[PDB]
Amino acid sequence: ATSTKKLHKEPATLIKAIDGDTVKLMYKGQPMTFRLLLVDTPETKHPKKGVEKYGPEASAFTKKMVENAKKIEVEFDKGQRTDKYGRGLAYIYADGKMVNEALVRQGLAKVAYVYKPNNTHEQLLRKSEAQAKKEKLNIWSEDNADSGQ
Ligand SMILES: Cc1cn([C@H]2C[C@H](OP(=O)(O)O)[C@@H](COP(=O)(O)O)O2)c(=O)[nH]c1=O
């Protein structure tokens, strides 16, 4: 990138994944946490016994994912580069693929947290989420709050 055009794609080094949308990597050579943009996990606070539903599933999904990826990159949007929590906001790409899209592919993370101007990849994640709905991938299975304990 000799000049600036759209976003700023850069390299990254996986360090320790914690949740499905939370993975600490290495940026600029220093340790930092990154949060998938335009996406949100199905409540993965993992307090103790978990909800026994989508607890241990999304977090590991991205864990082994970037863990086996040959390379890890990030794409900061045109909006801010860090949130109020000091988290880095960008799109992680594993093997030249959009990891965020992989999650929506397995119906593990639904689109959420959309605030301009950080939403350039909101279109691709949009049509993708719709495909996950027709694919019924976990979260997109049942549809009601009754008889689930
Ligand atoms: C991802 C994202 C999060 N947020 C805020 C809303 C949420 O506030 P609260 O912390 O009060 O819930 C929090 C969610 O981030 P996470 O998706 O990392 O949990 O960050 C934005 O304002 N814009 C964004 O693009």
On whether the CB atoms of residues 141 and 74 are closer than 8 A, the answer is: no
User: Looking at 57, 81, 87, 126, which residue is catalytic?
Assistant: 87
* φ and ψ of 5, to 5 deg: -135, -75
- Residues 129 and 135: their CA atoms lie apart, in Å, by 10
Domains of the chain: 1-149 (2.40.50.90)
**Interatomic CA distance for residues 134 and 124, integer angstroms:** 16
Breaks (C-N over 2.5 A) in the chain follow: none
Name residues whose C-beta falls within 8 Å of residue 17's C-beta, 6 or more positions apart in sequence. Answer: 23, 24, 59, 62, 63, 66, 67
Q: Which of these, 67, 75, 69, lies nearest to 7 by C-alpha position? A: 75
Q: How far is CA 68 from CA 51, 53, 62, 95, 135, in A?
A: 27, 25, 10, 9, 25
Structural biology method used: NMR
Q: Which residues line ligand 1 (CB under 6 A)?
A: 21, 35, 37, 40, 83, 87, 113, 115, 118
Task: Tally DSSP H helices, then E strands, for the chain.
Answer: 3, 7
The number of the ligand 1 atom at minimal distance from the alpha carbon of 118 is: 25
